[PDB]
């Protein structure tokens, strides 16, 4: 039911598979480009 009955990794180490890794890498990158977008162009803010 869990991530394989045996324990391979240590305590505190995490792993992400295909369906959830693409979720982290895609929300992490969009967050960076959203904070910065407001400072683009002749009339960008500060």
């Amino acid at each position: 039911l869990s991530l394989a009955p045996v324990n391979i990794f240590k305590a505190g180490a995490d792993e992400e598979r295909a369906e959830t890794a693409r979720l982290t890498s895609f929300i992490g990158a969009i967050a960076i480009g959203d904070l910065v977008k407001s400072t683009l162009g002749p009339k960008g803010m500060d």
């Binding site: 394989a4 045996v6 391979i8 990794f9 240590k10 180490a13 295909a18 890794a21 890498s25």
Partner: protein, 528 residues
């Protein structure tokens, strides 16, 4: 007598033990989780893994050796698979993600045999007999072409396939010419070896990925001592020096006594004549550029400038011996030994400048026959340079193997389909409870084609069946999996080449690890 729980082992109540079959099933399940992570990172259409260092660092890689190295595991069997791949990279350099897939698939096939009442030593005995049939069959279909300087092209096509998997594929034609041209230069042809200390790999971030080039000299990250020295020269005789430019000082506990005024005035005169004596000795011999390991002085810096004689300060240890081999000069420990026959020769010594930073680098080229070359990697990302360095090391290690052994086989799955038929055909004449172990070997050997097809997007059992049916009917052992969708399953036409000793090790080394695991039955470890 009331045999109360008497104490036998220290900390007996905090220790655990597995025995019998349940301990053997835990090994297989632990080696099935590790080998299924590396399945996706196989072949030209594979995908790579994100790795986060313990402190704060990020690594992106496709190599099988480094992935299992930076992954921290706690299972003991999982630590055996890490060492299985590490022992492959240093011996060959290519195939380190192919061994753990085969070993993991070799253990899974033995799970059904154990459940039927089969002794594990009997399985580990039948496996070795099969590995002697596959290796003896691999020499029969091996083809050796040639290796020299004048016709280089099969060597290029060998390094083209290994680079096909890594991220460096946009420019992988250019990076296949650097790897081949930088090996036959530094490699001897009588002793048949390669000195990797003679090849320097230096990467500098910023720029473009296709700007990577091969330099036929030495590039050192330093600059001239005085800001008013000429940046380039056209005919320089390199004067390699080890000793500094300071006045001499003995190592024993010297003490110099000054008991008068004339002894004091004779000491100022001593210091200033020693500086002028040094520049006279360098200029007399005809030297044009000075290279020093230790630092200069405030006074010895102008004398070099005033005499039109540029110099480089504080260069490293290993870099000095590369300039000596490249330029053809010799290293002198004093000024008295500096003669005209101990000088190098460069054709051009420039000082390249990067963008809006203060990073200056000294380059040395246009030399005669050399035994030292450097690789200059460029790129616009931190993770691109590190992965580019790893991919180039794999390309160099493939060519080094071809010098020892010319003969090659054809990849893309062709070697595995052919090897799995020889084992299965010979297993039909072995009636001693070994046909089961031999048949299990030939079934785990076909996981490599079923990993390339699944990654490509095709059906494994539908494509793999059609390839064996075509190979038996014809007499062509060079048919593989069309991963790149080119139309022809013939690997000879598609120019897919694999070194023979690379494939031999992936079978001989992978079998022996399975013998340890099948031999281990008890575990005794503390509890947490």
């Amino acid at each position: 007598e009331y045999g109360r729980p008497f104490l036998i082992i220290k900390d007996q109540d905090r220790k655990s033990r597995l025995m019998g079959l349940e301990a053997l099933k835990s090994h297989i399940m632990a080696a099935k989780a590790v080998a299924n992570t590396m399945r996706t990172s196989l072949g030209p259409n594979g995908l790579d893994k994100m790795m986060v260092d313990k402190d704060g660092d990020v690594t992106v890689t496709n190599d099988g050796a480094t992935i299992l190295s930076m992954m921290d595991v706690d299972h003991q069997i999982a630590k055996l698979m890490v060492e299985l791949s590490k022992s492959q990279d240093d011996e060959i350099g290519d195939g380190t993600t192919g061994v753990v897939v085969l070993a993991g698939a070799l253990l899974e096939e033995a799970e059904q045999l154990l459940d039927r009442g089969i002794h594990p030593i009997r399985i580990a005995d039948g496996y070795e007999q099969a590995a002697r049939v596959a290796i003896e069959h691999l020499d029969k279909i091996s083809d050796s072409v040639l290796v020299d300087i004048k016709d280089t092209e099969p060597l290029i096509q060998t390094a083209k396939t290994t680079l096909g998997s890594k991220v460096v594929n946009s420019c992988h034609r250019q990076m296949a010419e650097i790897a081949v041209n930088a090996v036959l230069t530094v490699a001897d042809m009588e002793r048949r070896d390669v000195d990797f200390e003679l090849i320097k790999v230096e990467g500098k971030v910023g720029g473009r990925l296709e700007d990577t080039k091969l330099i036929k000299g030495v590039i050192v990250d330093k600059d001239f001592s005085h800001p008013q020295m000429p940046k380039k020269v056209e005919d320089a005789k390199i004067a390699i020096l080890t000793c500094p430019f300071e006045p001499p000082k003995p190592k024993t506990k010297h003490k110099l006594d000054v008991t008068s005024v004339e002894d004091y005035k004779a000491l100022q005169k001593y210091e200033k004549e020693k500086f002028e004596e040094m520049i006279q000795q360098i200029k007399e011999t005809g030297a044009n550029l000075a290279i020093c390991q230790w630092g200069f002085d405030d006074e010895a810096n102008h004398l070099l400038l005033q005499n039109n004689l540029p110099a480089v300060r504080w260069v490293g240890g290993p870099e000095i011996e590369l300039i000596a081999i490249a330029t053809g000069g010799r290293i002198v420990p004093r000024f008295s030994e500096l003669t005209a026959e101990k000088l190098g020769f460069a054709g051009l010594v420039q000082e390249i400048s990067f963008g809006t930073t203060k990073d200056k680098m000294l380059v040395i080229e246009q030399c005669k026959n050399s035994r030292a070359v450097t690789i200059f990697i460029r790129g616009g990302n931190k993770m691109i340079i590190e992965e580019a360095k790893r991919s180039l090391h794999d390309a160099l290690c493939v060519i080094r193997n071809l010098i020892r052994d010319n003969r090659v086989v054809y990849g893309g799955g062709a070697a595995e389909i052919s090897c799995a038929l020889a084992v299965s055909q010979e297993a039909d004449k072995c009636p001693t409870l070994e046909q089961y172990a031999m048949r299990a070997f030939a079934d785990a050997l076909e996981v490599i084609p079923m990993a390339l097809s699944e990654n490509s997007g095709m059906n494994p059992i539908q494509t793999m069946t059609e390839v064996r049916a075509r190979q038996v009917k014809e007499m062509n052992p060079a048919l593989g999996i069309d991963c790149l969708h080119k139309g022809t399953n013939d690997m000879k036409q598609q120019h897919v080449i694999e070194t023979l000793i690379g494939k031999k090790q992936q079978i001989s080394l992978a079998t022996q690890m399975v013998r340890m695991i099948l031999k281990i039955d008890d575990i005794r470890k503390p509890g947490e």
